[PDB]
Design a binder for these strands. Structure first.
Length: 626
DNA sequence: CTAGTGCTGA
DNA sequence: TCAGCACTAG
């Protein structure tokens, strides 16, 4: 039909009319700073949209290309960037459209599947690569991944999703989509009713492209309002750190971590054989061949039948971990706990990892979020690399690529040092400046011994108590935390003495607790001014948000600096979990990468914390579990 | 024979 | 998060 092929030469198919090809004379400055009149071709919606957002759009392909269109990019400061892709997986999908939105101009849509002259993208590469031009994106991680994977270099970025998330102060988890944000801040409905229309086809319908253009032009007005809103709330530091942390995260996701298939198979066979042996032993002990070991009620009934009792001659009724500890003087329950451990490992990690390794490259690629967590720390999904077992044997599976070497660096006592800085405790700072660990100090003041005499067990009691009480746990509740997560058995009188002694000397933390509990404020802030508003008062969250948020800020600034400092030796950032950062470098640059990483982490720590000097433990490792 | 909720730990 | 196990419905 002639109506549907009116603009087929530009790879546009007309569905419901509502499209007109119009030519107008534009005014632009030549490279020599001379106003040169140029005539372009742009498409417009025949039926005007009720909103004020821009809807005109160019389309640049192999034939329609005009050399003077690059004059739009000259002497700009912000540009709206949005890309449409054939699918979500970066490795199995290509980029369909690149969209650049420039103020008081139509959006420029690059038809990637119909571009073959590499000079067509010459100006796009410069406008993306320039550090003085701010690129506005929605969910910038996705677009940055897709652009970097396709040999585009992107340097500056301003994610409207990040600004919207920070401004809401973690009040709501859902929302924060382009329609929601634009409705909230501009009072305009984008009509995002496109149900993920077909993009793989070379021809694209009218409504698809007009939805694409309005999703890009609206980012300029959102930038204008959100910049002022961030400046008003003094969130510019956190916003800048987060925006610059997009590229490190995308680099981590693209690089991934390699998996040794041979060692993985060997470990899987060994663990499965051990599981079978333990299952047979438990079957013999439970005296029920048909019993399903995994069934909770069945094992409860079996143990009840066998009549394993307490020291108080009390029978078990729940197989929770805390309950199982009380009953340990029988072989049956020991075998049951061992089997539970083995089964948890086998069914959580070994059998689940092969679903995540890509056979095309033999690597695990993770999805890193940076604002879903309440504290602000990174969170990983699909393969939850934070949920990997911490045992040395398990982590030995992960290895660097061929002809490379890992460099693992992690902070020491970062939460405690941040707490000392924020609360301004007189004694903690003076201790740290003399090179004594706060765990050692806590152990010494508890045990009344001098610093040299502290053993490892006292250090362990200190490790429990310091993390226990800094976040406001009551002395009664210290028992459960100590026994559950460290195995120490403590008498409540001993806990009372520990609490009194701990808060008698560290005056700063006591004053901090008193102020936070007296004020009962609903708004809290970190040292990067990342603000959060809780629905109601929560003492533990109140005392925990500042330190952990500042730790997240320190790690993010470290990644931002490290990504720039590693470009000389082609280092690859692989992972960032807890207070740990992993980078792979070639074996020739083994020595320099260590100094680069140490300097980056130390500068990041010293930017925020000023009283205390942070130290980093770095080791050159052949594999993760070294 | 397939669907689910509802409930219990690792 | 993640897995798995008794109890309603055709």
């Amino acid at each position: 039909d002639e109506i549907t092929k009116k603009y087929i030469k530009d790879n546009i198919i007309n569905v419901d009319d509502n499209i007109i090809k119009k030519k107008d004379i534009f005014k632009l400055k030549n490279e020599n700073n001379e106003i040169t009149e140029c005539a372009f071709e742009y498409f417009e919606s025949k039926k005007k949209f009720d909103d004020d957002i821009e809807s005109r759009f160019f389309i640049i392909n192999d034939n329609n290309y005009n050399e003077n269109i690059n004059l739009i990019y000259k002497d700009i400061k912000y540009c709206g960037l949005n890309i449409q892709t054939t699918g979500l997986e970066v490795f199995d999908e290509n980029i369909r459209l690149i969209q650049i939105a420039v103020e008081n101009y139509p959006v420029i849509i690059y038809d990637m599947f119909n571009i073959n002259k590499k000079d067509i993208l010459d100006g796009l590469r410069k406008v993306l690569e320039n550090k003085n031009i701010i690129k506005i994106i929605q969910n910038g991680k996705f677009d940055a991944k897709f652009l970097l994977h396709n040999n585009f270099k992107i340097e500056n970025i301003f994610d409207t999703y990040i600004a919207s998330k920070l401004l809401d102060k973690n009040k709501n988890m859902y929302g924060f989509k382009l329609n929601n944000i634009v409705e909230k801040y501009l009072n305009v409905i984008l009509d995002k009713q496109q149900q993920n229309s077909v993009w793989n086809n070379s021809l694209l319908n009218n409504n698809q492209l007009f939805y694409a253009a309005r999703d890009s032009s609206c980012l300029l007005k959102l930038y204008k309002k959100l910049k002022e809103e961030i400046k008003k709330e003094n969130l510019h530091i956190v916003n800048d750190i987060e925006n610059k942390c997009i590229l490190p995260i995308c680099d981590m996701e693209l690089n991934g971590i390699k998996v040794d298939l041979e060692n993985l198979q060997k470990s899987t066979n060994e663990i499965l054989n051990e599981l079978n042996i333990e299952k047979d032993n438990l079957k013999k002990k439970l005296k029920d061949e048909n019993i399903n070991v995994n069934s909770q009620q069945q094992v409860l009934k079996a143990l009840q039948k066998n009549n394993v009792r307490d020291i108080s001659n009390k029978l078990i009724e729940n197989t929770s971990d805390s309950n199982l500890k009380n009953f340990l003087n029988h072989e049956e329950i020991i075998s049951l706990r061992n089997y539970r451990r083995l089964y948890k490992l086998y069914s959580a990690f070994y059998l689940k990892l092969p679903l995540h390794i890509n056979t095309k490259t033999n690597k695990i690629h993770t999805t890193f979020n940076q604002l879903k967590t309440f504290s602000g720390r990174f969170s990983s999904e699909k393969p939850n690399l934070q949920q990997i077992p911490r045992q040395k044997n398990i982590r030995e599976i992960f290895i660097p690529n061929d002809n490379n070497i890992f460099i693992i660096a992690d902070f020491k006592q970062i939460e405690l040092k941040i707490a000392a800085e924020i609360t301004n405790d007189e004694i903690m700072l003076k201790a740290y400046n003399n090179n004594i660990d706060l765990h050692t100090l806590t152990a010494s003041i508890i045990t009344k011994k001098n610093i040299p005499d502290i053993n490892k067990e006292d250090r362990h009691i200190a490790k429990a108590i310091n993390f226990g009480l800094i976040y406001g746990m009551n002395y009664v509740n210290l028992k459960n935390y100590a026994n559950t997560y460290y195995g120490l058995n403590m008498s409540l009188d001993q806990c009372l003495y520990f609490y009194n002694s701990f808060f008698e000397h560290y005056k700063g933390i006591y004053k901090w607790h008193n102020q936070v509990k007296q004020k009962r404020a609903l708004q809290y802030s970190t040292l990067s001014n990342r603000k959060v508003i809780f629905p109601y008062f929560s003492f533990t969250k109140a005392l925990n948000y500042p330190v952990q948020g500042t730790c997240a800020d320190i790690l993010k600034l470290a990644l931002v600096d490290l990504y720039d400092n590693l470009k000389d030796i082609n280092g690859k950032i692989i992972l960032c979990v807890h207070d740990e950062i992993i980078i792979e470098v070639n074996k020739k640059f083994q020595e320099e990468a260590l100094k680069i990483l140490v300097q980056s982490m130390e500068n990041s720590a010293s930017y925020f914390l000023k009283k205390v000097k942070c130290e980093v433990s770095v080791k050159i490792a052949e594999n993760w579990g070294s």
